[PDB]
């Protein structure tokens, strides 16, 4: 009761629309706050994307060092991996990390592609068990986050379980499961959002996301001191089309839920 009222608070007092889901795994509990509700994921997306190639390989060895051009012509909005290769290749296991560790939208797009395209990432999802997830769209028209529309949407229960299943659970084999966490721990944009709301010394692996309407997003496994490790999901999006970042809201919503 405590907690859902200090996130009652915290979302007045950002003036947004809050959604958490954390999945402890030491007792099997959950802490849900607008957890069934539809958000926007911009690119927290990314992760399943990138699990879809992973599952991919599974049945491709070589798979992951397949190589991919880069081209002016795949440029995107933000590319900060991929403006370094333009005219060479790419591996798709380079693209990977760079869509998951440094929000690179090309690499993304190249993830999107090889696998069919955004119908087939929800159709993964869906072979998953997860019936909520949908990627409609390709970067960047992924994170216009316009309120009321459910393109590239999820819930945080929804998202929440589906991690879970991704980095702690079955969905993918020992080696591209243990792919995925590394390559997340290893992200780079996340150390303002859950990871600033908790103790120094956990370990976190994360994907964030951003878009329009101030929208800030962060979906994290973590491993706390000495515990069972957490699955997070923090999503805000806010009234204005222009509305800035507040990763901040997703740090103070990650140490109300782990206090
Ligand atoms: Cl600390």
């Known amino acids: 009761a405590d907690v859902q009222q200090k996130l009652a608070e915290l979302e007045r007092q950002s003036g947004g629309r809050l959604g958490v889901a954390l999945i402890n795994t030491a007792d099997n509990s959950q802490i849900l706050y607008r957890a069934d509700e539809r958000f926007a994921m911009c690119x927290t997306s990314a992760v399943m994307?990138?699990?879809?190639?992973?599952?991919?390989?599974?049945?491709?060895?070589?798979?992951?060092?397949?190589?991919?051009?880069?081209?002016?012509?795949?440029?995107?909005?933000?590319?900060?991996?991929?403006?370094?290769?333009?005219?060479?290749?790419?591996?798709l296991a380079e693209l990977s990390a760079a869509a998951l560790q440094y929000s690179d939208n090309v690499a993304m797009n190249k993830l999107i592609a090889h696998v069919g395209?955004?119908?087939?990432?929800?159709?993964?999802?869906?072979?998953?068990?997860?019936?909520?997830?949908?990627?409609?769209?390709?970067?960047?028209?992924?994170?216009?986050?316009?309120?009321?529309?459910?393109?590239?949407?999820?819930?945080?229960?929804?998202?929440?379980?589906?991690?879970?299943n991704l980095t702690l659970g079955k969905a993918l084999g020992d080696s591209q499961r243990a792919q995925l966490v590394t390559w997340m721990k290893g992200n780079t944009t996340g150390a303002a959002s859950i990871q600033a709301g908790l103790p120094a010394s956990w370990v976190v692996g994360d994907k964030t996301g951003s878009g329009?309407?101030?929208?800030?997003?962060?979906?994290?496994?973590?491993?706390?001191?000495?515990?069972?490790?957490?699955?997070?999901?923090?999503?805000?999006?806010?009234?204005?089309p222009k509305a800035e970042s507040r990763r901040?809201?997703?740090?103070?919503?990650?140490?109300?839920?782990?206090?």
């Open 212 to 240: 329009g309407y101030g929208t800030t997003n962060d979906i994290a496994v973590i491993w706390p001191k000495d515990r069972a490790p957490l699955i997070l999901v923090t999503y805000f999006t806010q009234p204005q």
């Open 117 to 164: 395209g955004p119908a087939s990432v929800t159709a993964f999802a869906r072979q998953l068990g997860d019936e909520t997830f949908r990627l409609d769209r390709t970067e960047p028209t992924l994170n216009t986050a316009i309120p009321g529309d459910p393109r590239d949407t999820t819930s945080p229960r929804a998202m929440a379980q589906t991690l879970r």
């Open 49 to 91: 994307a990138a699990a879809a190639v992973l599952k991919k390989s599974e049945s491709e060895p070589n798979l992951l060092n397949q190589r991919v051009e880069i081209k002016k012509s795949d440029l995107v909005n933000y590319n900060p991996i991929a403006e370094k290769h333009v005219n060479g290749t790419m591996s």
């Open 248 to 259: 901040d809201v997703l740090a103070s919503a990650a140490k109300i839920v782990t206090d």
